[PDB]
């Protein structure tokens, strides 16, 4: 698996060597019985839109982003529990690390790539 993280979104790509097997969209049909948020997981948290509590003066951005990556990990683990195979975490170094201290099975992670480009719109 390739878990792609940004501060605004998460993607999940199933892969075999050089090729993408599936990208886990709504049309994947392996996300049907998902109890967590299915991919692509947009970060629609309260601080990103503005309803919330604890406006900017609280400086809760890190805690909110940590919980968002925790939910992303919940989705990844749910999809992995049926088709176990290792995961590669792709994203900014800060996002990778926030994910690492939140992942349910951090010993399943084989690699972390922090220099991949156009993580939101990329192929």
């Amino acid at each position: 698996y390739t878990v792609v993280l940004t501060r605004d979104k998460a993607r999940l790509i199933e892969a075999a060597n050089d090729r993408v097997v599936a990208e886990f969209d709504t049309d994947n049909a392996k996300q049907n019985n998902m109890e967590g948020i299915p991919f692509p997981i947009d970060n629609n948290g309260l601080y990103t839109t503005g309803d919330g509590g604890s406006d900017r003066s609280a400086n809760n951005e890190n805690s909110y982003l940590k919980e968002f990556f925790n939910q992303v990990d919940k989705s990844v683990q749910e999809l992995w529990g049926e088709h176990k195979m290792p995961l590669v975490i792709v994203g900014d170094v800060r996002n990778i690390s926030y994910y690492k201290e939140v992942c349910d099975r951090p010993e399943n992670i084989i690699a972390t790539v922090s220099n991949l480009t156009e993580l939101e719109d990329g192929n």
Binding site: I37, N44, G45, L46, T49, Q71
Partner: protein, 84 residues
């Protein structure tokens, strides 16, 4: 708002009450013109002594006592006014 499941299915309409039902029950004294049943359709049918309005309202045609019955081959509910 994670899972975005706040789906608007907007239906908050309802009509005003119509206050249908049985107005006078069995064995009660009744005078002509008194409304006995308000209803939609003939949940109750008019027997002797009671008339039926354009609205299917049942009313006493003459004085007396209201009587409820099940009569006929359709086992219909009937309201009558007995002279008593």
């Amino acid at each position: 708002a994670h899972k975005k499941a706040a789906g608007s299915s907007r239906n908050g309409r309802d009509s005003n009450p119509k206050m249908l039902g049985v107005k006078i029950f069995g064995g009660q004294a009744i005078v002509a013109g008194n409304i006995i049943v308000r209803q939609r359709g003939t949940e109750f049918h008019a027997g002797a002594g009671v008339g039926m309005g354009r609205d299917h309202t049942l009313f006493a045609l003459n004085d007396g006592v209201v009587k409820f019955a099940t009569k006929g081959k359709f086992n219909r509910r009937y309201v009558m006014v007995e002279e008593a």
